[PDB]
Amino acid sequence: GAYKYLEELQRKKQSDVLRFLQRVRVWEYRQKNVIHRAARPTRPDKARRLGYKAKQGFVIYRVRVRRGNRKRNELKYQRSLRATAEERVGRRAANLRVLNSYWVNQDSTYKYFEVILVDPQHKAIRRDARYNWICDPVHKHREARGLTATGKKSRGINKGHKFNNTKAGRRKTWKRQNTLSLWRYRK
Amino acid sequence: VKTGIAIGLNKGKKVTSMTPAPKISYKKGAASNRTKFVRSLVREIAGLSPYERRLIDLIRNSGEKRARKVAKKRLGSFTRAKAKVEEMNNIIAASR
Amino acid sequence: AHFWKPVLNLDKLWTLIPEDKRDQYLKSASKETAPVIDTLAAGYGKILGKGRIPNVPVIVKARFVSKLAEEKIRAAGGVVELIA
Amino acid sequence: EKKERLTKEAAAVAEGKSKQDASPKPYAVKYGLNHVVALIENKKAKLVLIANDVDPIELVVFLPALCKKMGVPYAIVKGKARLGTLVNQKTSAVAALTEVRA
Amino acid sequence: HFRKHWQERVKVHFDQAGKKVSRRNARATRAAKIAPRPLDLLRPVVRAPTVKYNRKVRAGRGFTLAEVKAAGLTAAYARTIGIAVDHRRQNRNQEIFDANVQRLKEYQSKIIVFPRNGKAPEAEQVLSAAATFPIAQPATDVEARAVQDNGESAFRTLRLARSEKKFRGIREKRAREKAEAE
RNA sequence: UUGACCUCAAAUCAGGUAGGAGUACCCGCUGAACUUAAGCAUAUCAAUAAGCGGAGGAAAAGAAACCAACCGGGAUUGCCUUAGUAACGGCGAGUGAAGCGGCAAAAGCUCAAAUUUGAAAUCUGGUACCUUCGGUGCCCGAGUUGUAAUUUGGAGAGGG
RNA sequence: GUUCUUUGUAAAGUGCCUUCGAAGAGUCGAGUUGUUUGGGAAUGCAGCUCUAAGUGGGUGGUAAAUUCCAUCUAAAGCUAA
RNA sequence: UUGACAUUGUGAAGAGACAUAGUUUC
RNA sequence: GAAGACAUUGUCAGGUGG
């Protein structure tokens, strides 16, 4: 297959050809709308290893954000831009459920992303039970509760002693440990 | 194996080992006979980044320790700068 | 974790024998059948010497021992085994 | 053609009791990209065709180099729908040929 | 430690008692749902970490793949039969290997397994299996043994072991710097 | 000239969907101050109240890129304990954990990454019929810039 | 408990020999800025910059060069109590 | 208010360092 | 048409500074 011949190539993000294509596509995406749709990705392997399957109901929106911090300037916006993008399209395309995202391109002023979306009222997705979990109602707007990759990263959620403050919900364990617990028969 | 006491260069209790099966999730980089060819192919296609040009150009004229330092400055570490600059030396050798 | 070294004086040192073989080993100088004692299984990591004890040779198993302790046990004719 | 082949071979295996090889062998182009690139590096191709017009060009740039390496006679055709016309798909972006009638 | 406004966040386990009854009812419900089975998976014996506790053993998570294979069956049938599995655990001790294998052998001897087809004989279940295959801390020695002596006095051993370990690098340095002479 | 394809569009197009309230609990974002520090200013009150988004009947987390440093343990969550210990801080007020151990509950697994290649075997939809929380058939179509079967590192696949 | 269908030359497991065993990138990691933590010579997070490797890579709470050892397989994902 | 990173492209000469010839300092 | 690798935008470091 071509999976690795693309993967090992797109890691080479500073070769002449890829910086040429980057100079092309960034201008294209600047002139298009901020949020928009391309009916086929620019990075198909990298889609296909997030949960994409090219069938009826899987959707790709492409998206744009400013670069820089939260100006109120030196406040640093704990939402990742990846997550920010996901919020934006999950608002616009409401019915759709976000599945994951990724990076295609960048610029000094902007960062251009792509997003994977699913239409779980579509019947292929209701069937085809590798993907009949998203139609369960808990996954409404995954992005804004942070259950995508970057959301979990910036919640701080991986295993460790480094992630001991934030492992099981930061506010949950705060409420666990900044809490007095009294029994009936004291101790 | 240990000594048989609590403290020593191999301390602790001594018992019969079993040497269990070497698990598949340690052999991650033992790469392939495919992906070597792949990685080489993409290298020759996509070429060489500018700092990789400057690196080998430094190795031509002004030695390789400065190149090691420069890799350690572009990237963070030393244990990756060593491998990258040695790989670049290997490529310069293979050019002839 | 590293710092579990709860002491046992040579004084106590027969309560480990629950009540009953206490007598049977007390009325015995047996170098052939001597009682074994497990400081670690009773939850003690190091021996210290405070006490004075009969001369009955009795075996003891532990990790850490002091000089008067091993001297007194060898005086009774018991012995220490430096298990880990 | 497939369904005619099936309604033939069902009777052929019910009465004639073949191994589902009573029907003859096919000789046809092989048109999936991953199929193609898998066949290459087994050198099970004698001609492959390549479409110039693909904006996700990363899909295709490695092919002439790889075909050169494996010594297979590549070719860059102009037009991808032109290649779809012979598979009965809108676009194929490649086609190959490995086995031919004499 | 009450300079904060703790008074809104207080947990008061009045419901210890009620939780207990709900819990026992859940046990009984799951068991009557699971009617012939013992309500618990067979769990192995394992010897703990953290030298403070190394004397003990502990009813761990799951037996291993290799020990199951030494019993001569597969994980796939084990988890139906009522046996657990861990896979990320690895056996590097033979007494434990043998003991877990012995537990499995006892279990396979001690159960009867219905067909998938049925005819469903009378089974008269047990509530738990931890009771019948109790975790058992092993013997280290019988109470009685003869004395032997070695004249080492059992303190100097520890002391010079300490000395050798703390001066190992320097003795190696001496050996290497005399070795690399001329 | 005619015509495949791509991309971008309009339709009171066929069929579908989201918003809003509630908001005790829950995931996130933004985020103060009084008070306190004999006063004062980093600090504490607080990663809190307020504000804003988003869900369910539980949510979140989750089968390790873990804890360890022991004869090694073994997903997660909660409880007792570690412990008011370690660590921190005008070592000031004060703040303040975690592993191990006992108990409750105990469930594992899936994708990409193999060429089915002697046969896209997959699928929405329309239509007709039927035993209708859906099946069979015919048809337009999606799809090779990859739908199904297989395989997920615990392993495993091809061959005999 | 019953009752009618029969799958099925399908599918699965099982040992022995051989060959391979593909394993996620603007991501890991490093610098610097701000915030945060009990985390202190620099834990986590976000932004900006530089940006990789595959007998590799992370982690091992005191710095920092080197060499070992141990455990693990990241950057994709679901799920009861 | 000044300097640094990237955005940030293609050019021809001069001075050059390198394998007639491409790699980069002005 | 003007302008053009400078501008500028995103991020950093000096002097001044109710």
Side-chain angles (χ1 to χ4, degrees), chain D residues 44-70:
Chain D
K44 291 154 78 187
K46 320 299 168 64
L47 172 55
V48 305
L49 300 188
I50 272 163
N52 56 344
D53 45 31
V54 185
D55 189 15
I57 201 84
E58 298 100 302
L59 286 167
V60 162
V61 285
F62 62 90
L63 290 172
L66 201 142
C67 284
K68 177 259 160 185
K69 189 88 76 152
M70 296 293 102

Short mmCIF file of all heavy atoms in Angstrom, two decimals, chain D residues 44-70:
data_model
loop_
_atom_site.label_atom_id
_atom_site.label_comp_id
_atom_site.label_asym_id
_atom_site.label_seq_id
_atom_site.Cartn_x
_atom_site.Cartn_y
_atom_site.Cartn_z
N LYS D 44 4.90 -8.07 -10.16
CA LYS D 44 3.79 -8.74 -10.82
C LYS D 44 3.05 -7.80 -11.76
O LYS D 44 1.84 -7.94 -11.93
CB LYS D 44 2.86 -9.35 -9.78
CG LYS D 44 3.49 -10.52 -9.03
CD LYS D 44 2.91 -10.74 -7.65
CE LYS D 44 1.59 -11.43 -7.70
NZ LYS D 44 0.96 -11.49 -6.35
N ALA D 45 3.75 -6.82 -12.32
CA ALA D 45 3.22 -5.91 -13.31
C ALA D 45 4.14 -5.87 -14.51
O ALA D 45 5.36 -6.06 -14.39
CB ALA D 45 3.10 -4.51 -12.78
N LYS D 46 3.54 -5.62 -15.67
CA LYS D 46 4.26 -5.40 -16.92
C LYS D 46 4.02 -4.02 -17.50
O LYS D 46 4.80 -3.58 -18.34
CB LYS D 46 3.87 -6.46 -17.96
CG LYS D 46 3.71 -7.88 -17.43
CD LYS D 46 4.98 -8.45 -16.82
CE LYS D 46 4.71 -9.73 -16.06
NZ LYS D 46 4.23 -10.81 -16.94
N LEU D 47 2.96 -3.34 -17.08
CA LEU D 47 2.76 -1.93 -17.39
C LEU D 47 1.79 -1.37 -16.37
O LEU D 47 0.77 -2.00 -16.07
CB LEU D 47 2.20 -1.75 -18.80
CG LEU D 47 1.75 -0.35 -19.22
CD1 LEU D 47 2.85 0.63 -19.02
CD2 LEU D 47 1.31 -0.31 -20.65
N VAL D 48 2.12 -0.19 -15.86
CA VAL D 48 1.24 0.57 -14.99
C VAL D 48 1.06 1.94 -15.60
O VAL D 48 1.96 2.45 -16.27
CB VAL D 48 1.76 0.69 -13.55
CG1 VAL D 48 2.02 -0.65 -12.98
CG2 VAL D 48 2.97 1.56 -13.50
N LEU D 49 -0.09 2.53 -15.33
CA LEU D 49 -0.46 3.83 -15.85
C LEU D 49 -0.72 4.76 -14.69
O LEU D 49 -1.16 4.33 -13.62
CB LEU D 49 -1.68 3.71 -16.71
CG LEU D 49 -1.58 2.80 -17.92
CD1 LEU D 49 -2.79 2.94 -18.76
CD2 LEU D 49 -0.36 3.12 -18.72
N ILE D 50 -0.41 6.03 -14.91
CA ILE D 50 -0.43 7.04 -13.87
C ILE D 50 -1.12 8.28 -14.42
O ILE D 50 -0.90 8.67 -15.57
CB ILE D 50 0.99 7.33 -13.37
CG1 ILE D 50 1.24 6.35 -12.25
CG2 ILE D 50 1.22 8.76 -12.95
CD1 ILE D 50 2.62 6.16 -11.87
N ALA D 51 -1.96 8.88 -13.58
CA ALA D 51 -2.70 10.06 -13.94
C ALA D 51 -2.01 11.31 -13.42
O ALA D 51 -1.66 11.38 -12.24
CB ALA D 51 -4.11 9.96 -13.39
N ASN D 52 -1.82 12.28 -14.29
CA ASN D 52 -1.19 13.53 -13.89
C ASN D 52 -2.08 14.34 -12.96
O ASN D 52 -1.59 14.97 -12.02
CB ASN D 52 -0.85 14.36 -15.11
CG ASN D 52 -2.04 14.63 -16.00
OD1 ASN D 52 -3.07 13.97 -15.87
ND2 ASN D 52 -1.91 15.59 -16.89
N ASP D 53 -3.39 14.33 -13.20
CA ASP D 53 -4.30 15.28 -12.57
C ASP D 53 -4.80 14.72 -11.25
O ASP D 53 -5.86 14.12 -11.16
CB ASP D 53 -5.45 15.68 -13.49
CG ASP D 53 -6.11 14.51 -14.20
OD1 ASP D 53 -6.14 13.38 -13.67
OD2 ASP D 53 -6.56 14.72 -15.34
N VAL D 54 -4.00 14.92 -10.21
CA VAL D 54 -4.38 14.61 -8.84
C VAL D 54 -3.84 15.71 -7.95
O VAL D 54 -2.62 15.81 -7.77
CB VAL D 54 -3.87 13.24 -8.38
CG1 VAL D 54 -4.41 12.94 -7.02
CG2 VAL D 54 -4.24 12.18 -9.34
N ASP D 55 -4.72 16.51 -7.37
CA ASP D 55 -4.27 17.60 -6.52
C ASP D 55 -3.69 17.07 -5.21
O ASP D 55 -2.75 17.67 -4.68
CB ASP D 55 -5.38 18.60 -6.25
CG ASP D 55 -4.88 19.86 -5.55
OD1 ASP D 55 -3.65 20.08 -5.51
OD2 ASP D 55 -5.71 20.63 -5.03
N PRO D 56 -4.22 15.97 -4.62
CA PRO D 56 -3.45 15.33 -3.53
C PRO D 56 -2.29 14.51 -4.08
O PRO D 56 -2.23 13.28 -4.04
CB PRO D 56 -4.52 14.50 -2.82
CG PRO D 56 -5.74 15.10 -3.19
CD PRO D 56 -5.59 15.44 -4.59
N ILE D 57 -1.30 15.24 -4.59
CA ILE D 57 -0.26 14.69 -5.43
C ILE D 57 0.70 13.79 -4.67
O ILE D 57 1.38 12.95 -5.27
CB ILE D 57 0.46 15.86 -6.09
CG1 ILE D 57 1.19 15.42 -7.33
CG2 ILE D 57 1.39 16.52 -5.14
CD1 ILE D 57 0.34 15.37 -8.49
N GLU D 58 0.75 13.96 -3.35
CA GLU D 58 1.50 13.08 -2.47
C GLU D 58 1.11 11.62 -2.65
O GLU D 58 1.95 10.75 -2.44
CB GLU D 58 1.29 13.51 -1.03
CG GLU D 58 1.78 14.91 -0.73
CD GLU D 58 0.67 15.94 -0.71
OE1 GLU D 58 -0.02 16.08 -1.74
OE2 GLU D 58 0.49 16.61 0.32
N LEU D 59 -0.12 11.35 -3.07
CA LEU D 59 -0.54 10.00 -3.40
C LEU D 59 0.28 9.37 -4.50
O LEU D 59 0.36 8.14 -4.56
CB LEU D 59 -1.99 10.03 -3.84
CG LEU D 59 -3.01 10.22 -2.73
CD1 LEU D 59 -4.35 10.53 -3.29
CD2 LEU D 59 -3.13 8.99 -1.91
N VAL D 60 0.87 10.17 -5.38
CA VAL D 60 1.31 9.70 -6.68
C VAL D 60 2.79 9.96 -6.94
O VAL D 60 3.40 9.28 -7.78
CB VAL D 60 0.39 10.34 -7.73
CG1 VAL D 60 0.94 10.32 -9.08
CG2 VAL D 60 -0.90 9.62 -7.74
N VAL D 61 3.39 10.92 -6.21
CA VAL D 61 4.76 11.34 -6.54
C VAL D 61 5.76 10.21 -6.38
O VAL D 61 6.76 10.15 -7.10
CB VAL D 61 5.23 12.55 -5.72
CG1 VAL D 61 4.59 13.76 -6.21
CG2 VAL D 61 4.98 12.38 -4.28
N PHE D 62 5.53 9.32 -5.43
CA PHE D 62 6.48 8.24 -5.22
C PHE D 62 6.42 7.17 -6.30
O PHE D 62 7.33 6.34 -6.36
CB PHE D 62 6.26 7.60 -3.84
CG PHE D 62 4.92 6.97 -3.65
CD1 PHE D 62 4.70 5.66 -3.96
CD2 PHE D 62 3.90 7.69 -3.09
CE1 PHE D 62 3.47 5.09 -3.77
CE2 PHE D 62 2.68 7.12 -2.89
CZ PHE D 62 2.47 5.83 -3.23
N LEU D 63 5.39 7.17 -7.14
CA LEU D 63 5.19 6.03 -8.03
C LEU D 63 6.23 5.94 -9.14
O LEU D 63 6.69 4.82 -9.41
CB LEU D 63 3.80 6.08 -8.63
CG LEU D 63 2.64 5.79 -7.71
CD1 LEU D 63 1.39 6.09 -8.48
CD2 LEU D 63 2.66 4.37 -7.23
N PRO D 64 6.59 7.01 -9.85
CA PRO D 64 7.57 6.82 -10.92
C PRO D 64 8.93 6.44 -10.40
O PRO D 64 9.62 5.62 -11.01
CB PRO D 64 7.57 8.19 -11.61
CG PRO D 64 6.31 8.81 -11.20
CD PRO D 64 6.17 8.41 -9.81
N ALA D 65 9.32 6.99 -9.25
CA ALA D 65 10.56 6.58 -8.61
C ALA D 65 10.52 5.11 -8.25
O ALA D 65 11.48 4.37 -8.48
CB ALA D 65 10.79 7.42 -7.37
N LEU D 66 9.41 4.68 -7.68
CA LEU D 66 9.33 3.31 -7.20
C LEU D 66 9.28 2.34 -8.36
O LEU D 66 9.88 1.26 -8.31
CB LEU D 66 8.09 3.16 -6.33
CG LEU D 66 8.10 1.98 -5.37
CD1 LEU D 66 7.47 2.36 -4.10
CD2 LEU D 66 7.34 0.87 -5.94
N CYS D 67 8.56 2.72 -9.41
CA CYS D 67 8.49 1.90 -10.60
C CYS D 67 9.84 1.84 -11.30
O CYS D 67 10.20 0.81 -11.88
CB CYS D 67 7.42 2.47 -11.52
SG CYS D 67 5.76 2.10 -10.98
N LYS D 68 10.59 2.94 -11.26
CA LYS D 68 11.95 2.93 -11.79
C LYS D 68 12.80 1.95 -11.01
O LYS D 68 13.56 1.17 -11.59
CB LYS D 68 12.53 4.33 -11.70
CG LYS D 68 13.96 4.45 -12.15
CD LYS D 68 14.92 4.51 -10.97
CE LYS D 68 16.33 4.15 -11.40
NZ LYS D 68 17.27 4.07 -10.27
N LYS D 69 12.70 2.01 -9.68
CA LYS D 69 13.49 1.14 -8.82
C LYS D 69 13.18 -0.33 -9.10
O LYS D 69 14.09 -1.13 -9.33
CB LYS D 69 13.19 1.48 -7.36
CG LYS D 69 14.07 0.82 -6.32
CD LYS D 69 15.33 1.61 -6.05
CE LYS D 69 15.08 2.83 -5.17
NZ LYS D 69 16.29 3.20 -4.38
N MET D 70 11.90 -0.69 -9.12
CA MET D 70 11.52 -2.06 -9.39
C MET D 70 11.54 -2.40 -10.88
O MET D 70 11.16 -3.53 -11.24
CB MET D 70 10.13 -2.35 -8.83
CG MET D 70 10.04 -2.26 -7.33
SD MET D 70 10.96 -3.53 -6.47
CE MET D 70 12.37 -2.56 -6.01
#
